[PDB]
């Protein structure tokens, strides 16, 4: 496996080089935002109401990337549907402050419509 | 212009995914396709880059090991 792995690795470096060479506000997001372990589940949709959801590591992350019951991401607009925490358990967005933070089980995992 | 360079990527990045074994879902391989080749016929930037957000979203939404900062850190450890 080690040749496929040499030729893999050179890929994925090319790729990404190619990325930063491209500078894109929106794909920086992402990736940035998956630097921090702040990742998509699904593909993100183009369309409207149409379902986001990412997981959202801490609350240094949530409170950069949402704002009342709006979340920013890739350059866009959603407004939140529901969050979640790791044991599948809701949580209001009143909950997530920075008094009753670490009082959540983190991960959080936030669902959204596009705006 | 940066609509060959993006164009070029979508079809690195089509290959990154396949290299991941994408295949094995049929469903999965087919959007990945169907993205690459809205990029690739995108006639307008815009178009072409949010399509783009979506298709790197699945390589980014892949738990496996893509893993960034790695890549980063080997990109660092030379130069």
Not at chain 1, 38 to 42: A, E, K, T, Y
Not at chain 1, 93 to 97: V, Y
């Given at each position: 496996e080690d040749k496929r792995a040499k030729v893999t690795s050179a890929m994925q470096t090319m790729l990404f080089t190619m990325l930063r060479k491209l500078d894109n506000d929106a794909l920086n997001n992402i990736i940035n935002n998956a630097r921090d372990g702040?990742?998509?589940?699904?593909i993100i949709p183009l369309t409207t109401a149409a379902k986001l959801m990412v997981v959202v590591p801490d609350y240094g992350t949530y409170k950069n990337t949402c704002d009342g019951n709006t979340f920013t991401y890739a350059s866009a607009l959603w407004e939140i549907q529901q969050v979640v925490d790791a044991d599948s358990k809701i949580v209001q967005?009143?909950?997530?402050?920075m008094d009753n933070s670490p009082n959540l089980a983190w991960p959080l995992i936030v669902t959204a419509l596009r705006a | 212009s940066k609509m060959s360079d993006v164009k070029c990527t979508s079809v690195v990045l089509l290959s990154v995914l396949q290299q991941l074994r994408?295949?094995?879902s049929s469903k999965l391989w087919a959007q990945c396709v169907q993205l690459h080749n809205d990029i690739l016929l995108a006639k307008d930037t815009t178009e072409a880059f949010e399509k783009m957000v979506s298709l790197l979203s699945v390589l980014l939404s892949?738990?496996?090991?893509?893993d960034i900062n790695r890549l980063c850190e080997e990109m660092l450890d030379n130069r």
């Open positions: 702040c990742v998509p589940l699904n967005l009143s909950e997530i402050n | 994408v295949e094995s892949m738990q496996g090991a893509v």
